[PDB]
Design a protein around this nucleic acid. Structure first.
Lengths: 62, 134, 123, 171
RNA sequence: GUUAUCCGGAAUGAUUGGGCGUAAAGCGUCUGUAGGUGGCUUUUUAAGUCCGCCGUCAAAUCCCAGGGCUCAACCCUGGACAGGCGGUGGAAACUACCAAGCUGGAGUACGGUAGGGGCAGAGGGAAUUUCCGGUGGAGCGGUGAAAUGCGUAGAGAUCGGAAAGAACACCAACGGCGAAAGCACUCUGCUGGGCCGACACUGACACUGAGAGACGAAAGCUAGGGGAGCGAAUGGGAUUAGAUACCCCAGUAGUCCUAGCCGUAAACGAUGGAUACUAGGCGCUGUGCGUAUCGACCCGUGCAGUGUUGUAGCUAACGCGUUAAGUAUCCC
């Protein structure tokens, strides 16, 4: 299941970001946010590598 | 399952018999099957057996020995790769080498199949030299 | 240095055979003008009074050149012909002076190996 | 203590001897600084039978012959099939001296560095060419050739080992 | 003969052909773009690859074979392998491509699980110093030995009362976690990461990473707090020929915190990362299965991580050795 990985990582970045911006100095979870961004980004380049229209739907969903 | 499936088998051969263990377990892809098919019939090894463990067909390969010595195999096997991934080598039917005069063989990928120097020198075809053993 | 991309950028290159004579810079031996004909000492293990002529060259450099042989005629403002070759004992002397050539006479009374010192045959 | 060692020296027509270097190696003591002689002797008949040996003693000649008695218990035979040359090329390092040996045409006298050439001109091979890659040493050099010509196989024993009956050989 | 220039030797710029623990050399560690390399099966095109044929790469040179100068040098006649590029006809194993599946690589979902992972908030008690009281009266403190200091204005010692900042004894282990730096008084909150199982899911989504970005002990600096101890500089005493020093007594910046900058360390495992394979013994940590009881044990084990001796192999040696400095592949 791929779109649950992208969507799940998106909610991960939402909850972790609204953690981090009202907190502002945790330099440990910064790596977690950046590993999630990079991991999701290699997924988006993967599904963009496979398809057009379907990845256009992944952009249009979020 | 690393980068190479041929340094897979080959490095399992060198690491197999440099510790004198006369038994190899490797994956059985098409080109591994072809190499052990053109390698059991050339007297280097003894037997190759396919089987399965979790329905994954593998090759166990029995190496040669001799009798109770300081080391039970006298002639060290000396396997070597040539056409590395990222540096492909290619030869005509001129460059194709007689390894040590012929005591080694150079298994290589013709358009026919994969041959040895005997079976690609008579053909006159040439191709990508996988590796030569001696 | 992999075959891929650390080396089809470049390995590096060695510089040259570095010139063992920075003057003479065309080719082998070059006309000189004597400026000083002083005498200096070698490093610590040796002990001598080696007699060098600091010489201006026609190239554009000025350089202290050694004077071989025993006798020497070389006064102030004479003309010599320097050649390459490092005298080890003297710091700074890089060059020799040819003997028997222009305005630098051959050595006095030498009968072993004369072509290095510019002395014609006796007998 | 019978005397003069005439019968006991074994006149050495069977093994001809040469040094290849005699370096004076020295140790210091409380009294001072005293030296012994390390000689390296390569023994061998021209039949194909050589071996190195080191020795050291305060005399020169006892170090040479002492290295010889160490050497003439250390012999391999040279696999040299053809008209006094080599079956195939070989390379084998020992320590930090690497030696590439290469067979030659019969119109080629042995060309190698002094230690390698010494153990081959005593080995009775006539047609080889061996470059030395690595050390300036003489002992590990020569002993590296000895290891580089132990591991060398003819065509008859490779034909015997592989099981292939016979072809692919001009002679 | 000397000199100069060039190549060799020189594997001393390394594709053939080197290295990076300690010899010169692994970025401090990590994320990731470009780019490089990449699992298995089946099918398609042939760009690479290979084979045939054809065109051309002037002549001279070099190579072979003849011939001519009395030979040679040199001249001449004929021939051609390489190898380059192009046209064209074939092959499909490998790289690439087209399409379709696959799961062990990688993830996710789920259930557990361990932790000084991080940050924030609360709370804690020894100890030290200072102050305030009661006592008592001559030294206390310090040293190799002394002295400066403090002390009759009552020191130190002892008991009580406050206040202050900073650090957190035993537990502490050749232990756990983090990418490294680092992280230990306890509790709470938010939150990272790891490990293990079932097929529960997708189907190669992988590795590395130029430039880039982040973090990055300590000392340092800007701004504001705070300041007990310790303590560069400084000052005094001592030792000393001399002492700007080691010793001692005071002692400022600093040490701590807020917000930044700085971006270096023996940032060390003196060892970049990743995958696959190659004896064992003795351990520790986390989980999983079976035995044993039915419950804690306890034995073997499946893995992951951490350590100590050690076979093979490598190494100049010392040593390293499944967490390689082994065998190979990739990337910087």
């Amino acid at each position: 299941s791929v779109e649950f990985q992208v969507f799940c990582f998106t909610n991960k970045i939402r909850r972790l970001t609204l953690h981090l911006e009202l907190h502002k100095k945790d330099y440990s979870s910064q790596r977690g946010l950046r590993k999630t961004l990079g991991k999701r980004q290699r997924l988006l380049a993967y599904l963009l590598k496979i398809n057009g229209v379907r990845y256009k739907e992944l952009i249009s969903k979020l | 399952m690393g980068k190479d499936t041929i340094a897979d088998i080959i490095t399992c051969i060198r690491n197999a018999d440099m510790n004198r263990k006369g038994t190899v377990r490797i994956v059985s892809t098409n080109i591994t099957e072809n190499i052990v098919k053109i390698l059991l019939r050339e007297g280097f090894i003894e037997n190759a057996r396919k089987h399965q463990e979790r329905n994954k067909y593998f090759l166990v390969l029995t190496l040669r020995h001799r009798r109770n010595k300081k080391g039970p195999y006298l002639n060290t096997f000396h396997l070597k790769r040539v056409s590395r991934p990222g540096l492909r080598i290619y030869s005509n039917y001129q460059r194709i080498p007689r390894i040590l005069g012929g005591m080694g063989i150079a298994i290589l990928s013709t358009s026919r199949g994969i041959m040895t120097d005997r079976e690609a020198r008579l053909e006159g075809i040439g191709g990508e030299i996988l590796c030569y053993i001696w | 240095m992999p075959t891929i991309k650390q080396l089809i950028r470049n390995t590096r290159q060695p510089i040259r055979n570095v010139t063992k004579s920075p003057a003479l810079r065309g080719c082998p031996q070059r006309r000189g003008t004597c400026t000083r004909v002083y005498t200096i000492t070698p490093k610590k293990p040796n002990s001598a009074l080696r007699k060098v002529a600091r010489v201006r060259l026609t190239s554009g450099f000025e350089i202290t050149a050694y004077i071989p042989g025993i006798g020497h005629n070389l006064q102030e403002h004479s003309v010599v012909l320097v050649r390459g070759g490092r005298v080890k004992d003297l710091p700074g002397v890089r060059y020799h002076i040819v003997r028997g050539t222009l305005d630098a006479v051959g050595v006095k009374d030498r009968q072993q190996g004369r072509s290095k010192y510019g002395v014609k045959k006796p007998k | 203590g019978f005397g003069s060692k005439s019968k006991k020296e074994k006149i050495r027509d069977g093994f001809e001897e040469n040094v290849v270097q005699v370096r004076r190696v020295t140790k210091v003591v409380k009294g001072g600084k005293h030296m012994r002689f390390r000689a390296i002797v390569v023994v061998g008949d021209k039949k194909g039978q050589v071996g190195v040996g080191v020795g050291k003693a305060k005399e020169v000649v006892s170090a040479v012959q002492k290295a010889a008695v160490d050497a003439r218990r250390n012999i391999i035979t040279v696999p040299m099939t053809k008209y006094l040359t080599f079956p195939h090329r070989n390379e084998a390092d020992y320590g930090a001296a690497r030696v590439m040996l290469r067979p030659a045409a019969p119109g080629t006298g042995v060309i190698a560095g002094g230690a390698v050439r010494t153990v081959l001109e005593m080995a009775g091979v006539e047609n080889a060419l061996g470059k030395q890659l690595g050390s300036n040493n003489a002992l590990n050099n020569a002993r590296a050739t000895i290891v580089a010509v132990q591991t060398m196989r003819q065509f008859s024993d490779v034909a015997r080992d592989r099981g292939i009956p016979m072809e692919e050989l001009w002679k």
